[PDB]
Amino acid sequence: GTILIDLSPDDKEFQSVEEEMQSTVREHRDGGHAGGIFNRYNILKIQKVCNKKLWERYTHRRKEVSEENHNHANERMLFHGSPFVNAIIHKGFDERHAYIGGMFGAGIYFAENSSKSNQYVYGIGGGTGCPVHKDRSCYICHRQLLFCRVTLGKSFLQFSA
């Protein structure tokens, strides 16, 4: 039930997603090891993901959280990078997209920094880099990230290195 609609680079919606992508790049403490060495991206395509069933699943749960948190879903737009992006867009997030060894337990992780999610595109720690060249810092191969609508509700605050 998923269809992908291409956005024109002229569309203000394309532009505001691109801007969030570019403006949230930072330097990482691994010096580029996991995600590569870069200060910005070349954006090749942005597509809107439409799946009625997955959308209503999302909104049904959003309402539940909202009613548990003084009518405040605490919804954000956040980045997610994963080897499983194609399963995610067709079947939704589930158990199988969790980070079992993440510092905040086994759950599904999202970032405000696009460059942080970029570190997971080829796997945890960048895996072995791109399929074609085995290069975590590959400048040739096409990468994909998700920009996602996320319900946080009442969020537990963990201070941390």
Partner 1 sequence: MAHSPPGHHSVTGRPSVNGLALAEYVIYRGEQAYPEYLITYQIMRPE
- Helices (H), ranges, 68-100: 85-91
- Name residues whose C-beta falls within 8 Å of residue 154's C-beta, 6 or more positions apart in sequence: 68, 69, 74
CB 102 within 8 A of CB 125: no
Only one of the segments 11-19, 54-62, 74-82, 134-142 lies at the binding site for ligand 1V0 (rule: CB under 6 A); that segment is 74-82
Binding partner 1 (rule: CB under 8 A), the pick from 11, 40, 53, 131 is: 40
Q: Is 139 in the site for partner 1 (CB under 8 A)?
A: yes
With binding defined as CB under 8 A, does residue 109 bind partner 1? yes
The listed partner (partner 1, ligand 1V0, Zn ion, none) that binds 85, CB under 5 to 8 Å by sort, is partner 1
Compute the least distance from the CB of residue 129 to Zn ion, in Å.
Answer: 7
- Which are the contacts of 78, defined by CB distance < 8 A and separation ≥ 6? 110, 111, 112, 147, 148, 150
Residues 111-130: x where in contact with Zn ion by CB under 5 A, - otherwise, as a string:
-------------------x
Contact 97, 108 (CB under 8 A): yes
The answer to whether residue 110 forms part of the interface with partner 1 (CB under 8 A) is yes
Would you count residue 128 as binding partner 1 (CB under 8 A)?
Answer: no
* DSSP states along 55-67: HHHHHHHHHHHHH
Structural contact between residues 72 and 154, judged by C-beta atoms closer than 8 angstroms? no
138 assigned binding-site residue? yes
Measure the CA–CA gap between 78 and 146, rounded to whole angstroms.
Answer: 8
**Is 73 or 130 the residue whose CB approaches Zn ion more closely?**
130
When asked if residue 82 is in the footprint of ligand 1V0 (CB under 6 A), the reply is: yes
Residue 148 assigned ligand-binding role: no
Give SS3 for 3. Answer: strand
- For the annotated binding site for Zn(2+), the residues are 130, 133, 138, 141
Return residues touching ligand 1V0 (CB under 6 A). 79-83, 99, 109-111, 116-117, 120, 123-124
